């Protein structure tokens, strides 16, 4: 499953 | 919401505290409370909302995948029952957020920064629903995600520079949508490439801090393109 | 408990699933349900109970410390309010576990393995209450932790070899109690040293797998002794 | 704060 925008 | 009796400023301060304590369920409840006060959200407050719910749904999505994977590998009812429970709770969180966006966050968002940010969220949360959806209901969910993303893309293209982090994050997630949900890997790739290229041509205009922000997301685009090609 | 209508075997299977999904709140609720069926717990089931609640309270303890630390460093009411909220919820979880141990886990535990395991838990959960307690109430909480630990030590010394992982974990945590709660660093050190030494003299009797288990905990003892001396 | 038994 490809990374979407992470949550920093 | 039990948050009705608490000050908006206090809910915001408690949301910041909850982030520090890594208490994302509380953070979400606090930011829900804040939204329900009815005032528009600042930039910083929009981010608190985003971080709270992304953490909550991320945990649920991860739990869902583990269980769904066990369910498949076992081709007794407990795995399915429990996966349905997690799924229902995930859907509840998605519906909560979408409820907030629709009542009345999006319609009160006049500025491009605010509207694209919320429309992007709308796409993301329909996308999460689409991840667990089965059959024709799925088609409509998918169309709702696409329509929300598309509207946000159209605004960001008219109103924001190509290096804008929100425009870039939007394009990143919309591309993920194309790749993972819509079965359009070529659309995914084209969008990621085009977004990356136009941002790179505009990096020369940025300060050191804006450059750092933009390039961070540009790297995430390149990583996906590498994986996809 | 809403778990009354679910089979014991299903609650146990769902607790295992929840562990895999890293859903420790669900895991705790499932194991609570299982305990409330009234049957004694196996070894494996005791561990599921322990892991579920240790994860839940560990998150709360960590959140508590962050907030309490912010509270101190700021010598508005929101930090105190929210720390009290977290604290109350932690106390609720501790009281739940202690309620389970007292009704009727401990009193039905005939074997040394089961009784020491539950008495150890009792000590741990009074210790967590003591961590957040203020004043004279604290003294009684502290005495309850010590009395529970002490009874477990007396049984484990009569009934278990010095390399028994439960005896070792007990001694580890009791030592932590002495160091961090009871203000007896010398008692802490003596116990850790003595426990370590007697286990080491008995390692020769163990199989390769028992040796690996014992030495793992022996290392944790040595790490504390290094920190404390 | 000194480590107690971890939860594996
Ligand atoms: C969807 C989305 C895009 C951009 C941001 S952000 O506030 O610009 N931001 C800060 C930094 O520029 C990079 C970054 C990475 C991850 C999350 C947020 C940011 C927020 C959001 Br939501
Ligand atoms: C308090 C306590 C002590 C020992 C165990 S255990 O089931 O023996 N165990 C397995 C292994 O021997 C080491 C270990 C490390 C961490 C947690 C459990 C274990 C359980 C418990 Br609770």
Short mmCIF file of C-alpha atoms and ligand atoms in Angstrom, two decimals:
data_model
loop_
_atom_site.label_atom_id
_atom_site.label_comp_id
_atom_site.label_asym_id
_atom_site.label_seq_id
_atom_site.Cartn_x
_atom_site.Cartn_y
_atom_site.Cartn_z
CA UNK A 1 0.00 0.00 0.00
CA UNK A 2 1.56 3.28 -1.22
CA UNK A 3 2.27 6.14 1.26
CA UNK A 4 -0.11 9.11 1.31
CA UNK A 5 0.87 12.35 3.06
CA UNK A 6 2.13 11.38 6.57
CA UNK A 7 0.86 13.05 9.75
CA UNK A 8 3.81 14.78 11.53
CA UNK B 1 -20.86 17.03 22.17
CA UNK B 2 -19.94 17.14 25.87
CA UNK B 3 -17.53 19.90 24.81
CA UNK B 4 -20.36 22.47 24.57
CA UNK B 5 -19.72 23.81 28.09
CA UNK B 6 -15.98 24.34 27.52
CA UNK B 7 -14.46 27.50 26.02
CA UNK B 8 -13.23 27.36 22.43
CA UNK B 9 -9.82 28.64 23.52
CA UNK B 10 -9.64 25.89 26.20
CA UNK B 11 -10.61 23.12 23.75
CA UNK B 12 -7.84 24.36 21.44
CA UNK B 13 -5.31 24.42 24.27
CA UNK B 14 -6.42 20.95 25.42
CA UNK B 15 -6.06 19.65 21.85
CA UNK B 16 -2.43 20.82 21.85
CA UNK B 17 -1.84 19.12 25.19
CA UNK B 18 -3.42 15.90 23.92
CA UNK B 19 -1.13 15.93 20.90
CA UNK B 20 1.87 16.18 23.24
CA UNK B 21 0.50 13.35 25.36
CA UNK B 22 -0.12 11.32 22.17
CA UNK B 23 -3.81 11.13 23.13
CA UNK B 24 -5.30 11.41 19.67
CA UNK B 25 -8.83 10.27 20.58
CA UNK B 26 -9.03 13.11 23.11
CA UNK B 27 -7.42 15.48 20.60
CA UNK B 28 -10.09 14.60 18.04
CA UNK B 29 -12.90 15.10 20.55
CA UNK B 30 -11.47 18.47 21.56
CA UNK B 31 -11.12 19.67 17.96
CA UNK B 32 -14.62 18.40 17.15
CA UNK B 33 -15.81 20.53 20.08
CA UNK B 34 -13.91 23.51 18.72
CA UNK B 35 -15.40 23.17 15.23
CA UNK B 36 -18.89 22.93 16.73
CA UNK B 37 -18.48 26.39 18.30
CA UNK B 38 -19.20 27.52 14.75
CA UNK B 39 -16.26 29.90 14.21
CA UNK B 40 -14.01 29.30 11.21
CA UNK B 41 -10.65 27.66 11.99
CA UNK B 42 -7.25 29.32 11.64
CA UNK B 43 -4.42 27.65 9.78
CA UNK B 44 -2.93 26.22 12.96
CA UNK B 45 -6.34 24.96 14.10
CA UNK B 46 -7.02 23.29 10.74
CA UNK B 47 -3.78 21.36 11.22
CA UNK B 48 -4.73 20.30 14.76
CA UNK B 49 -7.99 18.94 13.36
CA UNK B 50 -6.14 17.12 10.58
CA UNK B 51 -3.49 15.57 12.85
CA UNK B 52 -6.04 14.41 15.44
CA UNK B 53 -8.30 12.58 13.02
CA UNK B 54 -5.51 11.25 10.75
CA UNK B 55 -3.99 9.59 13.82
CA UNK B 56 -7.33 8.14 14.96
CA UNK B 57 -8.33 6.74 11.52
CA UNK B 58 -4.75 5.63 10.79
CA UNK B 59 -4.87 3.32 13.83
CA UNK B 60 -8.24 1.97 12.69
CA UNK B 61 -7.07 1.47 9.07
CA UNK B 62 -3.99 -0.42 10.29
CA UNK B 63 -6.09 -2.57 12.60
CA UNK B 64 -8.57 -3.15 9.75
CA UNK B 65 -5.81 -4.39 7.38
CA UNK B 66 -4.30 -6.78 9.93
CA UNK B 67 -7.72 -8.33 10.56
CA UNK B 68 -8.85 -8.35 6.92
CA UNK B 69 -5.56 -10.06 6.10
CA UNK B 70 -6.10 -12.72 8.77
CA UNK B 71 -9.67 -13.08 7.48
CA UNK B 72 -8.39 -13.79 3.94
CA UNK B 73 -5.66 -16.20 5.06
CA UNK B 74 -8.31 -18.19 6.92
CA UNK B 75 -10.47 -17.94 3.77
CA UNK B 76 -14.91 -19.60 13.04
CA UNK B 77 -16.79 -16.25 12.81
CA UNK B 78 -14.72 -14.22 15.28
CA UNK B 79 -12.26 -12.72 12.72
CA UNK B 80 -15.12 -11.47 10.49
CA UNK B 81 -17.19 -10.26 13.44
CA UNK B 82 -14.26 -8.29 14.83
CA UNK B 83 -13.20 -6.92 11.42
CA UNK B 84 -16.80 -5.71 10.94
CA UNK B 85 -16.67 -4.04 14.36
CA UNK B 86 -13.44 -2.20 13.53
CA UNK B 87 -14.84 -1.35 10.11
CA UNK B 88 -18.05 0.12 11.57
CA UNK B 89 -16.02 2.26 13.99
CA UNK B 90 -13.77 3.49 11.18
CA UNK B 91 -16.85 4.38 9.14
CA UNK B 92 -18.24 6.27 12.14
CA UNK B 93 -15.06 8.36 12.40
CA UNK B 94 -15.09 9.06 8.66
CA UNK B 95 -18.76 10.10 8.84
CA UNK B 96 -18.01 12.36 11.83
CA UNK B 97 -15.27 14.26 9.96
CA UNK B 98 -17.35 14.46 6.78
CA UNK B 99 -20.24 15.71 8.90
CA UNK B 100 -18.00 18.50 10.20
CA UNK B 101 -16.71 19.41 6.76
CA UNK B 102 -20.31 19.52 5.44
CA UNK B 103 -21.69 21.33 8.54
CA UNK B 104 -20.50 24.18 7.87
CA UNK B 105 -16.60 24.21 7.46
CA UNK B 106 -16.48 23.91 3.64
CA UNK B 107 -19.33 26.35 2.93
CA UNK B 108 -17.85 28.99 5.28
CA UNK B 109 -14.37 28.59 3.77
CA UNK B 110 -13.98 31.58 1.42
CA UNK B 111 -10.19 31.59 1.04
CA UNK B 112 -8.41 29.18 -1.29
CA UNK B 113 -6.13 27.96 1.55
CA UNK B 114 -9.11 26.99 3.75
CA UNK B 115 -11.38 25.56 0.97
CA UNK B 116 -8.68 23.39 -0.69
CA UNK B 117 -7.60 22.16 2.74
CA UNK B 118 -11.14 21.03 3.64
CA UNK B 119 -11.96 19.68 0.19
CA UNK B 120 -8.73 17.67 0.35
CA UNK B 121 -9.84 16.26 3.73
CA UNK B 122 -13.20 15.40 2.19
CA UNK B 123 -11.43 13.40 -0.52
CA UNK B 124 -9.19 11.66 2.02
CA UNK B 125 -12.13 10.61 4.20
CA UNK B 126 -14.23 9.35 1.29
CA UNK B 127 -11.07 7.49 0.20
CA UNK B 128 -10.86 5.76 3.59
CA UNK B 129 -14.52 4.72 3.29
CA UNK B 130 -13.79 3.45 -0.21
CA UNK B 131 -10.95 1.31 1.16
CA UNK B 132 -13.43 -0.79 3.16
CA UNK B 133 -16.44 -0.53 0.81
CA UNK B 134 -17.89 -3.40 -1.24
CA UNK B 135 -19.78 -3.27 -4.54
CA UNK B 136 -21.97 -0.47 -5.94
CA UNK B 137 -22.00 1.60 -2.73
CA UNK B 138 -18.26 1.68 -3.40
CA UNK B 139 -18.75 3.25 -6.82
CA UNK B 140 -20.63 6.22 -5.34
CA UNK B 141 -18.10 6.60 -2.49
CA UNK B 142 -15.31 6.59 -5.04
CA UNK B 143 -17.06 9.23 -7.13
CA UNK B 144 -17.51 11.38 -4.03
CA UNK B 145 -13.79 11.17 -3.23
CA UNK B 146 -12.87 12.05 -6.86
CA UNK B 147 -15.31 14.97 -7.04
CA UNK B 148 -13.99 16.41 -3.77
CA UNK B 149 -10.34 16.02 -4.85
CA UNK B 150 -11.06 17.41 -8.32
CA UNK B 151 -12.75 20.56 -6.98
CA UNK B 152 -9.74 21.12 -4.71
CA UNK B 153 -7.32 20.64 -7.62
CA UNK B 154 -9.22 23.17 -9.75
CA UNK B 155 -9.09 25.79 -6.97
CA UNK B 156 -5.43 25.12 -6.08
CA UNK B 157 -4.46 25.43 -9.76
CA UNK B 158 -6.13 28.85 -10.00
CA UNK B 159 -5.25 30.22 -6.56
CA UNK B 160 -2.00 28.71 -5.26
CA UNK B 161 1.62 28.54 -6.52
CA UNK B 162 2.84 25.05 -7.59
CA UNK B 163 5.09 24.87 -4.49
CA UNK B 164 2.27 25.41 -2.00
CA UNK B 165 2.50 22.49 0.51
CA UNK B 166 -1.29 22.06 0.57
CA UNK B 167 -1.44 21.93 -3.25
CA UNK B 168 1.39 19.38 -3.11
CA UNK B 169 -0.14 17.25 -0.38
CA UNK B 170 -3.45 17.33 -2.27
CA UNK B 171 -1.77 16.17 -5.49
CA UNK B 172 0.11 13.48 -3.53
CA UNK B 173 -3.08 12.07 -1.99
CA UNK B 174 -5.17 12.43 -5.18
CA UNK B 175 -2.45 10.49 -6.97
CA UNK B 176 -2.62 7.79 -4.28
CA UNK B 177 -6.39 7.73 -4.87
CA UNK B 178 -5.86 7.12 -8.59
CA UNK B 179 -3.32 4.39 -7.93
CA UNK B 180 -4.94 2.50 -5.07
CA UNK B 181 -8.66 3.14 -5.34
CA UNK B 182 -9.56 4.14 -8.89
CA UNK B 183 -7.42 1.55 -10.69
CA UNK B 184 -5.82 4.29 -12.83
CA UNK B 185 -2.05 3.83 -12.24
CA UNK B 186 -1.22 5.90 -15.34
CA UNK B 187 -3.29 8.85 -14.09
CA UNK B 188 -1.55 8.49 -10.72
CA UNK B 189 1.87 8.63 -12.36
CA UNK B 190 1.10 11.53 -14.70
CA UNK B 191 -0.23 13.68 -11.85
CA UNK B 192 2.72 12.93 -9.55
CA UNK B 193 5.24 13.68 -12.36
CA UNK B 194 3.51 16.89 -13.52
CA UNK B 195 3.11 18.14 -9.93
CA UNK B 196 6.74 17.36 -9.11
CA UNK B 197 8.03 19.13 -12.25
CA UNK B 198 6.04 22.35 -11.85
CA UNK B 199 7.05 22.62 -8.19
CA UNK B 200 10.70 22.13 -9.06
CA UNK B 201 10.56 24.91 -11.70
CA UNK B 202 9.21 27.27 -9.00
CA UNK B 203 11.59 26.38 -6.11
CA UNK B 204 13.77 29.35 -7.07
CA UNK B 205 11.12 31.75 -5.67
CA UNK B 206 11.09 30.29 -2.16
CA UNK B 207 12.77 31.25 1.09
CA UNK B 208 14.91 28.64 2.87
CA UNK B 209 12.00 27.55 5.10
CA UNK B 210 9.40 27.35 2.30
CA UNK B 211 11.94 25.45 0.20
CA UNK B 212 12.38 22.90 3.01
CA UNK B 213 8.59 22.48 3.28
CA UNK B 214 8.01 22.06 -0.45
CA UNK B 215 10.95 19.73 -1.07
CA UNK B 216 9.84 17.50 1.80
CA UNK B 217 6.56 16.76 -0.03
CA UNK B 218 8.25 16.68 -3.45
CA UNK B 219 10.40 13.83 -2.09
CA UNK B 220 7.26 11.91 -1.10
CA UNK B 221 6.02 12.31 -4.68
CA UNK B 222 9.35 10.99 -6.05
CA UNK B 223 9.28 8.01 -3.67
CA UNK B 224 5.83 7.00 -4.96
CA UNK B 225 6.88 7.45 -8.59
CA UNK B 226 9.90 5.21 -7.91
CA UNK B 227 7.64 2.57 -6.39
CA UNK B 228 5.13 2.86 -9.25
CA UNK B 229 7.57 2.81 -12.16
CA UNK C 1 -19.97 -5.97 30.81
CA UNK C 2 -21.41 -6.04 27.27
CA UNK C 3 -19.28 -9.18 26.86
CA UNK C 4 -21.78 -11.30 28.83
CA UNK C 5 -23.52 -12.55 25.67
CA UNK C 6 -20.28 -13.66 23.98
CA UNK C 7 -18.66 -17.08 24.45
CA UNK C 8 -15.56 -17.30 26.65
CA UNK C 9 -13.66 -19.02 23.83
CA UNK C 10 -14.67 -16.20 21.43
CA UNK C 11 -13.61 -13.44 23.84
CA UNK C 12 -10.24 -15.18 24.16
CA UNK C 13 -9.87 -15.49 20.39
CA UNK C 14 -10.91 -11.83 19.94
CA UNK C 15 -8.35 -10.78 22.57
CA UNK C 16 -5.62 -12.48 20.51
CA UNK C 17 -6.85 -10.73 17.36
CA UNK C 18 -6.89 -7.37 19.17
CA UNK C 19 -3.31 -7.89 20.28
CA UNK C 20 -2.31 -8.47 16.64
CA UNK C 21 -4.22 -5.37 15.59
CA UNK C 22 -2.55 -3.43 18.44
CA UNK C 23 -6.03 -2.64 19.80
CA UNK C 24 -5.25 -2.86 23.49
CA UNK C 25 -8.43 -1.16 24.76
CA UNK C 26 -10.48 -3.82 22.96
CA UNK C 27 -8.08 -6.52 24.17
CA UNK C 28 -8.59 -5.38 27.76
CA UNK C 29 -12.38 -5.33 27.39
CA UNK C 30 -12.33 -8.82 25.90
CA UNK C 31 -10.13 -10.23 28.67
CA UNK C 32 -12.27 -8.50 31.30
CA UNK C 33 -15.24 -10.28 29.72
CA UNK C 34 -13.37 -13.58 29.86
CA UNK C 35 -12.48 -13.18 33.54
CA UNK C 36 -16.10 -12.36 34.35
CA UNK C 37 -17.21 -15.75 33.01
CA UNK C 38 -15.88 -16.93 36.36
CA UNK C 39 -13.57 -19.75 35.20
CA UNK C 40 -9.93 -19.65 36.29
CA UNK C 41 -7.46 -18.48 33.62
CA UNK C 42 -4.79 -20.65 32.00
CA UNK C 43 -1.20 -19.51 31.78
CA UNK C 44 -1.64 -18.17 28.27
CA UNK C 45 -4.85 -16.36 29.27
CA UNK C 46 -3.19 -14.77 32.31
CA UNK C 47 -0.59 -13.32 29.94
CA UNK C 48 -3.25 -11.97 27.57
CA UNK C 49 -4.84 -10.21 30.54
CA UNK C 50 -1.47 -8.82 31.62
CA UNK C 51 -0.44 -7.56 28.17
CA UNK C 52 -3.82 -5.92 27.50
CA UNK C 53 -3.94 -3.89 30.69
CA UNK C 54 -0.19 -3.10 30.84
CA UNK C 55 -0.52 -1.54 27.38
CA UNK C 56 -3.63 0.44 28.34
CA UNK C 57 -2.22 1.81 31.65
CA UNK C 58 1.23 2.34 30.10
CA UNK C 59 -0.29 4.78 27.58
CA UNK C 60 -2.11 6.56 30.41
CA UNK C 61 1.00 6.71 32.64
CA UNK C 62 3.04 8.17 29.76
CA UNK C 63 0.33 10.72 29.01
CA UNK C 64 0.10 11.53 32.74
CA UNK C 65 3.87 12.22 32.99
CA UNK C 66 3.95 14.48 29.93
CA UNK C 67 1.07 16.56 31.34
CA UNK C 68 2.29 16.57 34.95
CA UNK C 69 5.66 17.73 33.61
CA UNK C 70 4.07 20.56 31.63
CA UNK C 71 2.02 21.39 34.74
CA UNK C 72 5.21 21.72 36.83
CA UNK C 73 7.10 23.76 34.22
CA UNK C 74 4.19 26.21 34.16
CA UNK C 75 4.27 26.13 37.98
CA UNK C 76 -4.43 28.88 32.97
CA UNK C 77 -6.30 25.84 34.41
CA UNK C 78 -6.40 23.64 31.31
CA UNK C 79 -3.15 21.67 32.01
CA UNK C 80 -4.33 20.76 35.56
CA UNK C 81 -7.88 20.01 34.43
CA UNK C 82 -6.64 17.69 31.69
CA UNK C 83 -4.01 16.02 33.90
CA UNK C 84 -6.79 15.34 36.44
CA UNK C 85 -8.93 13.84 33.68
CA UNK C 86 -6.14 11.49 32.56
CA UNK C 87 -5.39 10.70 36.19
CA UNK C 88 -9.02 9.80 36.95
CA UNK C 89 -9.13 7.50 33.91
CA UNK C 90 -5.88 5.82 34.93
CA UNK C 91 -7.28 5.30 38.42
CA UNK C 92 -10.42 3.78 36.89
CA UNK C 93 -8.35 1.25 34.93
CA UNK C 94 -6.30 0.38 38.01
CA UNK C 95 -9.48 -0.08 40.06
CA UNK C 96 -10.96 -2.28 37.31
CA UNK C 97 -7.98 -4.66 37.31
CA UNK C 98 -7.82 -4.70 41.12
CA UNK C 99 -11.54 -5.40 41.14
CA UNK C 100 -10.92 -8.43 38.91
CA UNK C 101 -8.02 -9.68 41.00
CA UNK C 102 -10.15 -9.32 44.17
CA UNK C 103 -13.33 -10.75 42.55
CA UNK C 104 -12.42 -13.78 42.54
CA UNK C 105 -9.06 -14.41 40.60
CA UNK C 106 -6.70 -14.31 43.61
CA UNK C 107 -8.92 -16.33 45.96
CA UNK C 108 -9.50 -19.05 43.33
CA UNK C 109 -5.78 -19.25 42.50
CA UNK C 110 -4.54 -22.37 44.33
CA UNK C 111 -1.30 -22.96 42.42
CA UNK C 112 1.84 -20.96 43.16
CA UNK C 113 2.19 -19.96 39.47
CA UNK C 114 -1.32 -18.45 39.38
CA UNK C 115 -1.31 -16.83 42.89
CA UNK C 116 2.14 -15.17 42.56
CA UNK C 117 1.19 -13.95 39.08
CA UNK C 118 -2.00 -12.26 40.36
CA UNK C 119 -0.44 -10.97 43.57
CA UNK C 120 2.35 -9.46 41.46
CA UNK C 121 -0.30 -7.75 39.30
CA UNK C 122 -1.96 -6.47 42.47
CA UNK C 123 1.33 -4.89 43.53
CA UNK C 124 1.89 -3.38 40.08
CA UNK C 125 -1.56 -1.80 39.98
CA UNK C 126 -1.36 -0.38 43.50
CA UNK C 127 2.08 0.93 42.46
CA UNK C 128 0.53 2.77 39.50
CA UNK C 129 -2.06 4.33 41.82
CA UNK C 130 0.75 5.30 44.18
CA UNK C 131 2.54 7.06 41.31
CA UNK C 132 -0.30 9.60 41.03
CA UNK C 133 -1.37 9.68 44.70
CA UNK C 134 -0.90 12.63 47.07
CA UNK C 135 -0.51 12.63 50.86
CA UNK C 136 -1.85 10.12 53.41
CA UNK C 137 -4.07 8.23 50.92
CA UNK C 138 -0.70 7.56 49.29
CA UNK C 139 0.67 5.93 52.42
CA UNK C 140 -2.14 3.35 52.46
CA UNK C 141 -1.84 2.73 48.70
CA UNK C 142 1.89 2.20 49.14
CA UNK C 143 1.31 -0.25 51.97
CA UNK C 144 -1.17 -2.15 49.83
CA UNK C 145 1.36 -2.47 47.00
CA UNK C 146 4.08 -3.65 49.45
CA UNK C 147 1.80 -6.17 51.16
CA UNK C 148 0.74 -7.64 47.81
CA UNK C 149 4.33 -7.85 46.54
CA UNK C 150 5.58 -9.28 49.84
CA UNK C 151 2.97 -12.08 49.89
CA UNK C 152 3.97 -12.97 46.32
CA UNK C 153 7.67 -12.99 47.24
CA UNK C 154 7.02 -15.31 50.21
CA UNK C 155 5.12 -17.78 48.00
CA UNK C 156 7.62 -17.63 45.12
CA UNK C 157 10.49 -18.25 47.54
CA UNK C 158 8.79 -21.40 48.88
CA UNK C 159 7.28 -22.72 45.65
CA UNK C 160 9.34 -21.64 42.62
CA UNK C 161 13.00 -22.07 41.53
CA UNK C 162 15.12 -18.86 41.51
CA UNK C 163 15.14 -18.87 37.68
CA UNK C 164 11.35 -18.87 37.33
CA UNK C 165 10.51 -15.89 35.01
CA UNK C 166 7.51 -14.90 37.16
CA UNK C 167 9.63 -14.93 40.34
CA UNK C 168 12.19 -12.83 38.46
CA UNK C 169 9.69 -10.37 37.02
CA UNK C 170 8.14 -10.05 40.49
CA UNK C 171 11.53 -9.30 42.07
CA UNK C 172 12.29 -6.83 39.25
CA UNK C 173 9.06 -4.89 39.80
CA UNK C 174 9.19 -5.09 43.61
CA UNK C 175 12.70 -3.67 43.39
CA UNK C 176 11.40 -0.84 41.18
CA UNK C 177 8.74 -0.25 43.85
CA UNK C 178 11.42 0.10 46.54
CA UNK C 179 13.48 2.44 44.38
CA UNK C 180 10.79 4.69 42.92
CA UNK C 181 7.88 4.60 45.33
CA UNK C 182 9.09 3.58 48.78
CA UNK C 183 12.23 5.73 48.87
CA UNK C 184 14.34 2.68 49.81
CA UNK C 185 17.08 2.60 47.11
CA UNK C 186 19.24 0.28 49.24
CA UNK C 187 16.42 -2.26 49.58
CA UNK C 188 15.90 -2.00 45.81
CA UNK C 189 19.57 -2.73 45.15
CA UNK C 190 19.88 -5.60 47.65
CA UNK C 191 16.84 -7.38 46.21
CA UNK C 192 17.97 -6.97 42.59
CA UNK C 193 21.50 -8.22 43.43
CA UNK C 194 20.32 -11.19 45.54
CA UNK C 195 17.72 -12.19 42.92
CA UNK C 196 20.26 -11.92 40.10
CA UNK C 197 22.86 -14.02 41.99
CA UNK C 198 20.56 -16.88 42.97
CA UNK C 199 19.19 -17.12 39.43
CA UNK C 200 22.69 -17.22 37.98
CA UNK C 201 23.70 -20.08 40.34
CA UNK C 202 20.70 -22.07 39.05
CA UNK C 203 21.04 -21.41 35.28
CA UNK C 204 22.90 -24.71 34.92
CA UNK C 205 19.62 -26.62 35.45
CA UNK C 206 17.76 -25.00 32.56
CA UNK C 207 17.07 -26.05 28.99
CA UNK C 208 18.12 -23.70 26.17
CA UNK C 209 14.66 -22.08 26.00
CA UNK C 210 14.24 -21.63 29.78
CA UNK C 211 17.79 -20.23 29.91
CA UNK C 212 16.88 -17.65 27.25
CA UNK C 213 13.76 -16.65 29.22
CA UNK C 214 15.53 -16.34 32.56
CA UNK C 215 18.58 -14.50 31.24
CA UNK C 216 16.36 -12.00 29.45
CA UNK C 217 14.91 -10.86 32.82
CA UNK C 218 18.27 -11.20 34.60
CA UNK C 219 19.62 -8.64 32.11
CA UNK C 220 16.82 -6.23 33.04
CA UNK C 221 17.86 -6.61 36.68
CA UNK C 222 21.51 -5.87 35.79
CA UNK C 223 20.51 -2.80 33.76
CA UNK C 224 18.66 -1.35 36.77
CA UNK C 225 21.55 -2.13 39.12
CA UNK C 226 23.90 -0.33 36.70
CA UNK C 227 21.60 2.69 36.66
CA UNK C 228 21.21 2.63 40.45
CA UNK C 229 24.88 2.17 41.39
CA UNK D 1 12.16 6.67 35.80
CA UNK D 2 13.63 3.14 36.05
CA UNK D 3 12.32 0.32 33.75
CA UNK D 4 9.95 -2.25 35.24
CA UNK D 5 9.23 -5.51 33.41
CA UNK D 6 8.33 -4.57 29.78
CA UNK D 7 5.22 -5.87 28.03
CA UNK D 8 6.28 -7.94 24.94
C1 LIG E 1 -2.61 17.94 3.39
C2 LIG E 1 -1.65 18.86 4.04
C3 LIG E 1 -0.67 19.49 3.28
C4 LIG E 1 0.23 20.36 3.86
C5 LIG E 1 0.18 20.61 5.22
S1 LIG E 1 1.33 21.72 5.98
O1 LIG E 1 0.68 22.35 7.08
O2 LIG E 1 1.89 22.53 4.94
N1 LIG E 1 2.57 20.82 6.60
C6 LIG E 1 3.84 21.45 7.05
C7 LIG E 1 4.98 21.10 6.11
O3 LIG E 1 4.98 21.98 5.00
C8 LIG E 1 4.89 19.69 5.54
C9 LIG E 1 3.82 18.80 6.14
C10 LIG E 1 3.94 17.42 6.19
C11 LIG E 1 2.95 16.64 6.74
C12 LIG E 1 1.81 17.24 7.27
C13 LIG E 1 1.66 18.61 7.25
C14 LIG E 1 2.66 19.39 6.66
C15 LIG E 1 -0.80 20.00 5.99
C16 LIG E 1 -1.68 19.13 5.41
BR1 LIG E 1 -2.98 18.29 6.53
C1 LIG E 2 5.42 -10.50 35.44
C2 LIG E 2 5.67 -11.51 34.40
C3 LIG E 2 6.81 -12.32 34.48
C4 LIG E 2 7.06 -13.29 33.52
C5 LIG E 2 6.18 -13.46 32.46
S1 LIG E 2 6.49 -14.69 31.23
O1 LIG E 2 5.24 -15.17 30.74
O2 LIG E 2 7.42 -15.62 31.78
N1 LIG E 2 7.26 -13.96 29.96
C6 LIG E 2 7.91 -14.75 28.88
C7 LIG E 2 9.43 -14.62 28.96
O3 LIG E 2 9.95 -15.54 29.91
C8 LIG E 2 9.89 -13.24 29.41
C9 LIG E 2 8.82 -12.18 29.51
C10 LIG E 2 9.10 -10.83 29.33
C11 LIG E 2 8.10 -9.88 29.42
C12 LIG E 2 6.79 -10.28 29.69
C13 LIG E 2 6.49 -11.61 29.85
C14 LIG E 2 7.50 -12.56 29.79
C15 LIG E 2 5.05 -12.68 32.37
C16 LIG E 2 4.81 -11.71 33.32
BR1 LIG E 2 3.25 -10.64 33.13
#
